[PDB]
Paper text:
Here we present a GSH-sensing platform for live-cell imaging, termed targetable ratiometric quantitative GSH (TRaQ-G). In conclusion, we have designed, synthesized and validated a new ratiometric GSH sensor, TRaQ-G, which only becomes reactive in the organelle of interest. This sensor is based on binding of a spirocyclic SiR ligand to HT, which induces isomerization to the GSH-sensitive and fluorescent zwitterionic form. We conducted X-ray diffraction experiments and MD simulations for structural elucidation of the different TRaQ-G adducts to gain mechanistic insight into the varying GSH sensitivities of the molecules.
To understand the difference in reactivity between TRaQ-G-ctrl and TRaQ-G, we analysed the structure of both conjugates by X-ray diffraction. Whereas the spirocyclic form binds similarly to Me–TRaQ-G and TRaQ-G-ctrl, the zwitterionic form occupies an alternative pocket. MD simulations using the spirocyclic form as a starting point suggest that the side chain of residue F144 must rotate to allow for the ligand to occupy the alternative pocket and thus switch to its zwitterionic form. Using MD simulations starting from the zwitterionic structure, we found that the structure rapidly relaxes to a stable conformation in which the cyanamide forms a persistent hydrogen bond with the backbone carbonyl of residue P243. Instead, we focused on TRaQ-G, the ligand of which undergoes fluorescence and reactivity turn-on upon binding to HT. Once bound to HT, the strong fluorescence of the TRaQ-G ligand decreases upon reaction with GSH.
Residue numbers in the entry: 4 to 295
C-alpha cells in the first residue's frame, strides 16, 4: 500500500479561510467529491483516487482545521464543518456531484445530499455515521475509550494534551500496521496541541445513546432521506468494522434501495488503509454504470 501523496496542492478561499484540496482527473464530466473524517485528511484517499481519476474528476478537500486547510478559532462543531463544506462546494462552482464519503465526511455528505437531492448522482460510503442507540451498539473494545473521550476533563487531556486520537485511535482503526511515514502524514496537521480541538469535538458530536440529541436528529433525518431516495448507493464494509458491523452492513444492503454492498475483507474504521485497491477499483466500476 502506497505511502506517497503526489497531488499538487490546490487552495480556495472559503468564508475568509484558505482550504486545501486535491483536484485531479478530467475537467469535463460529473466530479467525484471525496470527504474524509476524524482524524484524517485527503491523505486517506491517496490510494483510492488513482483508480478513479483516469475516468472521472476527483476532488478531495481537507476539512477546515484539518490537513493543509487553515485553522480558524472555531469550536469545530459539526455545524462549523457544515458551513465550511457548504461554502467550499459553492466556491468551486460544483453543480451535480458523486459523493465518496467516510466517518464524519459521510455525515457532511449525507446532510448535504438531503438538502440538495437533485445534485447528488450517487453516494459511495463506508464506516459512516448512523445513530448508535445505546452504548451496547458501540464495539466493546472501543467503549470505555470513547466514553472517556466524551468528557471535558479526561477527554481533552487524552485527545489534546496526549494526542491520543492520532497516536492511538487512528492505528486502532486500521487492521494492518500503519508505517512511520503514514503516521507522520497523519500527525503533520496536529503537531501543535492548540490545533487539536477538532480531534476532540468530533467524538463529542457522535450520535451515541441519544446525545447530542441535535446530531442524533440530523443523522436520523438523512438516514430517513437515504432510505427513501432512489440515488445509486455503494456501501463498503469490513470485518469487524467499528461504526458499521457486518450485521448492520447486511441489514442496510437489504433496506437501502438501489444499494450494492462490497465486503472489503478485514477492516475497522479506515477501510481505505486495509483494502484501497478493491475500494478504488469497485468505485471506478460502479461509476461506469452510472448515468453521469
Ligand atoms: C468517526 C469514528 C472513527 C473511529 C476511529 C477508530 O475507532 C476505533 C478505535 O478507537 C480506539 C478505541 N480504543 C481501543 O480500541 C482500545 C482497546 C484496548 C485498550 C485501549 C484502547 C487502551 C489504549 C491502549 C493502547 C494505547 N496506545 C492507548 C490506549 Si487509550 C489512552 C486510547 C485507552 C483509554 C482508555 N480510557 C479512556 C481505556 C483503554 C485505553 N488500553 C489501555 N490501557 C487498552 O487496553
Ligand atoms: Cl470521532
Amino acid at each position: 500500500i502506497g505511502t506517497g501523496f503526489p497531488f499538487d496542492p490546490h487552495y480556495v478561499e472559503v468564508l475568509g479561510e484558505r482550504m486545501h484540496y486535491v483536484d485531479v482527473g478530467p475537467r469535463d464530466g460529473t466530479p467525484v467529491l471525496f470527504l474524509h473524517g476524524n482524524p484524517t485528511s485527503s491523505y486517506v484517499w491517496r490510494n483510492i483516487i488513482p483508480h478513479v481519476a483516469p475516468t472521472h474528476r476527483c476532488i478531495a478537500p481537507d476539512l477546515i482545521g484539518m490537513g493543509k486547510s487553515d485553522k480558524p478559532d472555531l469550536g469545530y462543531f459539526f455545524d462549523d464543518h457544515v458551513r465550511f463544506m457548504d461554502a467550499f462546494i459553492e466556491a468551486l462552482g460544483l453543480e451535480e456531484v458523486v459523493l465518496v464519503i467516510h466517518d464524519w465526511g459521510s455525515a457532511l455528505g449525507f446532510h448535504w445530499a438531503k438538502r440538495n437531492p437533485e445534485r447528488v448522482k450517487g453516494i459511495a460510503f463506508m464506516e459512516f455515521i448512523r445513530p448508535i442507540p445505546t452504548w451496547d451498539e458501540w464495539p466493546e473494545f472501543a467503549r470505555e475509550t470513547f466514553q472517556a473521550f466524551r468528557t471535558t476533563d479526561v477527554g481533552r487531556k487524552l485527545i489534546i494534551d496526549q494526542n491520543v486520537f492520532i497516536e492511538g485511535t487512528l492505528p486502532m482503526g486500521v487492521v494492518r500496521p500503519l508505517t512511520e511515514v503514514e503516521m507522520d502524514h497523519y500527525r503533520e496537521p496536529f503537531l501543535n496541541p492548540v490545533d487539536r480541538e477538532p480531534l476532540w469535538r468530533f467524538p463529542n458530536e457522535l450520535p451515541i445513546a441519544g446525545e447530542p440529541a441535535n446530531i442524533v436528529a440530523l443523522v436520523e433525518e438523512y438516514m430517513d432521506w437515504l432510505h427513501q431516495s432512489p440515488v445509486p448507493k455503494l456501501l463498503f464494509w469490513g470485518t469487524p468494522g467499528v461504526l458499521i458491523p457486518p450485521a448492520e452492513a447486511a441489514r442496510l444492503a437489504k433496506s437501502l434501495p438501489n444499494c450494492k454492498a462490497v465486503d472489503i475483507g478485514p477492516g475497522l474504521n479506515l477501510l481505505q488503509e486495509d483494502n484501497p485497491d478493491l475500494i478504488g477499483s469497485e468505485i471506478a466500476r460502479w461509476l461506469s454504470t452510472l448515468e453521469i
